[PDB]
Amino acid sequence: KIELCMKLLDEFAKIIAINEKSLIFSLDHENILDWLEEIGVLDSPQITEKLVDICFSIEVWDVLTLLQLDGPECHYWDLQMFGRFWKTSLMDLLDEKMMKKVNEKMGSILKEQYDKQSHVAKATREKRSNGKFPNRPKVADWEEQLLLMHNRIAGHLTKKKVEDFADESTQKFTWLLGVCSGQMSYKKEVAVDAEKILSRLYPDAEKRNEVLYHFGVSSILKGLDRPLHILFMQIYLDLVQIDSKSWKIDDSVQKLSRRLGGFNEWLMIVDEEKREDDGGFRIYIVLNLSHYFWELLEGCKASQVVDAHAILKIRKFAEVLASILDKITFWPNPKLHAYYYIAQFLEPLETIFHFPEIAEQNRKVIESFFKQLFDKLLEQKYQEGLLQDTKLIIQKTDKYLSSSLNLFNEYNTQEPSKIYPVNEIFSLFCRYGSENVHLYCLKMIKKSLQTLASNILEHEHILKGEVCIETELQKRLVCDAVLLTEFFGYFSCIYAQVSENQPSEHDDVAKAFMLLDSDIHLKTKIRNVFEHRFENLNSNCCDELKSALNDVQEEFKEVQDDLEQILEAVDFANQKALQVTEERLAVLESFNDMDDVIISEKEKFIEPLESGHFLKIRELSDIIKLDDGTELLVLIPESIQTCLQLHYMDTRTNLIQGMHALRTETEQIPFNARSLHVSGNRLVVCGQYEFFALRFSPQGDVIDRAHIKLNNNPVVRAKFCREIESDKRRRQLIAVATMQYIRIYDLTLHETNFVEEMVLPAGNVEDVEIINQEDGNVRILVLSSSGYLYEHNISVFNAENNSIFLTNVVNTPGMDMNGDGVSLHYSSTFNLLFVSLENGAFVAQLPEPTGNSTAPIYDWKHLNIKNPVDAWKETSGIIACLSTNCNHQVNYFHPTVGKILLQKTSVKRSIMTYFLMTSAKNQSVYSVLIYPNVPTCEIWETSWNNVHDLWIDDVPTERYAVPRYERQPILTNSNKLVYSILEFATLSGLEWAGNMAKKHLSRKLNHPAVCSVSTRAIVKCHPSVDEELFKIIDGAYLQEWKALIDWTESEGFGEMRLHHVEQLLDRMEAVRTRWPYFVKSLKREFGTVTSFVELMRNEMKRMPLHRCQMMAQAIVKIVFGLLSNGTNEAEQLIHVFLNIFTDQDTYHLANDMRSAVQETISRFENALKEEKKLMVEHENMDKESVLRIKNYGFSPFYGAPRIIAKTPESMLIAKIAETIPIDSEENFKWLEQLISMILEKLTRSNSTVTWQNLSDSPSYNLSRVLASCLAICDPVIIRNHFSRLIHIIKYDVEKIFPMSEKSYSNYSLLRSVELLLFVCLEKRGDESKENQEMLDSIVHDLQAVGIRNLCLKILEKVIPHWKDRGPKVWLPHVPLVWPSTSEDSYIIACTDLILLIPQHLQELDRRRDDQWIQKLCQLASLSYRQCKKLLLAMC
């Protein structure tokens, strides 16, 4: 019968715990203790357990009643622990703010559960409840019975005096502890009885309160095992923080763990069941407490005075953490983000190691902790769980299919930012690990290297960038590569910590010959790729470490073939990434037939990035690119409409930081601006009736302006024309639309005159598109009001007001349905035309032109869109447009092979404006939306997981802080792996490292770090500096130069090629230390030096006109060096160097090269003037302290002198370049040849080439370079060459004036004479005897020849023309910052020369003709300052 009562009371407890009505309540259960007395089983000890179970169930029922919740939607233990959470003395210690917080949170979750429920029980609850929390709802009748019998239970709970409750491991003891402190349902009599029995159990009060507190926290902890958990976590942290203020300095770790709950026993439960399905609550608690104490510690670090209490707190928590460290390793869930929390373990170790005493007393624990931590990295289940994780996603782009192996998004805001932070874990190992940890790690790496390499090579076909990553097995590849990389890096770091050799000779060679790019930029500390610090290593026990390292090195001999194979695969991937021509051709050709094209809206290729606060017609903002990578944003302000806002932003180091730091400027505009358009580098502002045009400089400063004022016909649209780099004739065509007509303005012909005007027959314009064909003809398509599309093409260009009736109509889209036309767009990259009408949109491929009389046939495809769309923008492969009937949605188009990806996005706010932009790091496409309110801007980006960058013409770059800042390509994971392999090889096996480094030397296919380690490896391989080392290096450089031929325009990447040529030009300098070897390499590669100079000349033309100065300087420097050092092709080399000036394809560049020479000569002086001073200081010094280089290359032309101090690296250089006595004089025979052939070129040049500007003529530049060269020769040389030049002049006057072929040659020679006199003038300061003798000889020669008479004859013919006939159009290129005809300019130039010559003759001749003064005064009256100064000097 006893078992029957056990079952009855158990069923009673279960049924009440679920709040379910049963017939038992109708009985008089208040005297249930009477019932048991009827049978007589009240003496049964086994029934009291079920009685206290009944009491517990009634308690949780009471908690449910107070909560006003009802229903068994929460487990029994949750509510039970929530009951123990109440007004019990555990919350006598809590403060008001946390009380408000917890009340608010439980109210919010209760309200959420409430609105989760249906209506009927909602009405029942609302009727039942008289108030919200914490007021108890209304009291019914049956709860009174339940409570009354609950309190009456106390009668059976006598159970003798103390002996029943002496057993601590009983349920009745837990109940007794619960009633003693604060259980609400129990009345005060029961509470005082419970307090009395506890006093009998524990006479003292200290242990009483200790066990009460421990029970409370252990209950709050044990309740968190079987899923409001976040709130309970938070209040646990709050209770711990409160209690931490009462910890004594002499407390034991066991007592402190007791105060925290059952902490030591809670974390020591290592069982499979506990690990399975746990939410990692233990590590959450440990990390939260550790992070709070770490924030406290780091806050106390910066203070000036140490706070004893805070230090005591941190110390006690550190002791606890040290005691428990060896247990927390087991808990991280392999199927969760185990590695993230493994990395997050950094703070507890930091605060443990802040105190050296704790770390010293706990050494074995720390070592075992780190050993298991490392063992976790190679465990199979952990790796499989990480692979199966849904947050591990590998980036996939269009060029690099998956070869980049990128797994980190810097702009992802989710909690697991770094799912696989192996580097942070290894850095922690390096920072705090001891010697034994390093030994274990080295052994494990040695064992695992071969398997890791084989697993990598299993997926070589996917490391080569041929296919993408699909399955979860293939992701293993990434989990290998990173791991392998880190292993090697770790090895290298430990080597640098334990071995001290520093040979200093390889560094000496690399510094002397400047083979390293960073050293070149320094001479014209560094941070390594892997940086780990060691703080717990002892140097007295190094030897065994060395042994381990040696073992690892031997392992490298067994795995080198696989490493070479993966290096080959990665190089193949890098080379393949830059070949995009065929993909683009296929994409463009795929649109030829409209029968095989679809529109897909299933792919989301644009995703939001971030909303920030940085700053009808919606074309109010646009962007312009600058040369140095900075960006200029132009926009129309709202407050003032008579100004234009310009913002300079620097987003090549970070987008967010770059947009934060803005440079604001205001440009005043005459009128209010309605619309804004930008093409390339110029912009058009559309006002009410007039419009404005601006053109900017490459530095971002405004250069050119043009204000144009034009029934009713206001301005509708206006846009520039697409410019072509191939078109030398740069026409600034702009099309302006008005409701009746289209006008075309050409800012290179006339500002107030339009080339053409076309008026619509019976319609209204809505949009106009202008297209610049390659032939030169310009196509224009205009969208009428009815929807008709009219196409015209222009072939002849004249600034004549012509009017045309538009009568060419193409097959209109949507036959017999077309609404009112809305917009037109033309994508030049894809050769596509978008037409947006009222009823929908259409796309077509622009067909080849046929004529001005017929009409072409268009094939149209519907874009699966109906609403009208107006504002269009285009960037790298990406088209965007703004729908007009709605103020929230944007549409994005991306054409792929035979399809057009479409995405329609909507934003919750009304949009003001937007603009597209290609990232300054060249890795994604951004779209910035500008709003009026406080969140001023939002930024969207191309989706990270699948980036569509087929049409981006650069590789990702960054401004890395090597503060020094350098533009370097992004270091992918594959290249990091390659660099790690190479560095480990240079450390371990030198022959293999040298053999492999010779393959990775091209700078256009490899990261700078890879090239640097390859050069270091090659240097180390050759210990004796010979011709072979420089032969290898300069062969790589010269092949890089030679490869420029194949990199034509259709090959794609344009900006990368430009920066690549700049890099080559910067690297050219270092050759000056090995000149004979470089000459030999040049001869063996190109055959002849003239071929190399021809290649440089060919590359000069392709460069933009405002950047060609650097390579002109390079050509001048190399030619001068070759001539100075002596070559057997001097004649042909000078021949081509001069032919550059006068050739049909290069004469426009003459003005550049002259300036280049005028720089080089100056640099030459900066050499010579230096060397002379060294001759002085060395006069009273030992002869064995300086050296003179006899084969200096072009070192003087670079400003470096030929006299260098005697140092070991100088000895290295002199061993190669040879030396001569320091006091040796100079030789200028090469200059003699240069001048002689320049003079011959001037004389034999073909004349009668008319010019509008004489300062840009080739012959003027040749004369100027002759003068600059003669300014440094020996005085006897000047005398000889000037005397030779003088006698070539023919002084016949009728034979040289008007137009004769000899006339222009004579003019050129006379100009040369004037320039040489100008040069000779400044030498009057020199007081040398030879200088005076040469000056007097030249003056006497000029007097004897008698050119002043010739000046009179020329002036006598010049003046009559001045008496007879004598008294803002944009340039094709951006301007850097009377007369009427060719004859008039020729006469002006003749006057200038023929007046300048006698003035210089008079000035130089420091030892009154009537005709002279008469002609001078007369011509002065006709004209000016030259005449006045000439008469003034005559007087």
Author numbering: 657 to 883, 891 to 1187, 1306 to 1396, 1416 to 1510, 1520 to 1771, 1933 to 2337, 2349 to 2358, 2372 to 2401, ...
Q: What wording appears in the published article?
A:
Among the >600 human ubiquitin ligases, UBR4 plays a particularly important PQC role, being an essential and conserved E3/E4 ligase found across eukaryotes. Aside from teaming up with various ubiquitin ligases, UBR4 activity is linked to two specific cofactors: calcium-binding protein calmodulin (CALM1) and KCMF1 (13, 16, 17, 20, 21). Our data show that the evolutionarily conserved UBR4 complex forms a megadalton E4 arena, in which inward-facing ZZ-DZB domains of KCMF1 act not as E3 ligases but as substrate receptors. The architecture of the E4 megacomplex is conserved across eukaryotes, but species-specific adaptations allow UBR4 to perform its precisely tuned quality-control function in diverse cellular environments.
To explore structural differences, we determined the cryo-EM structure of CeUBR4. Although the nematode E4 complex preserves the ring shape of the human enzyme, it displays notable adaptations, particularly in the dimerization interfaces that result in different topologies of the ring-shaped arena. Proteomic analysis of purified CeUBR4 pointed to a distinct substrate preference, with mitochondrial medium-chain acyl-CoA dehydrogenase (ACADM) showing stronger enrichment compared to SSBP1, which is preferred by the human UBR4 complex. In line with this finding, we observed well-defined extra density in the central arena of CeUBR4, closely resembling the elongated shape of an orphaned subunit from the tetrameric ACADM complex. The functional importance of the ring architecture is emphasized by its conserved shape and dimension in CeUBR4, despite pronounced differences in its helical scaffold and dimerization interfaces.
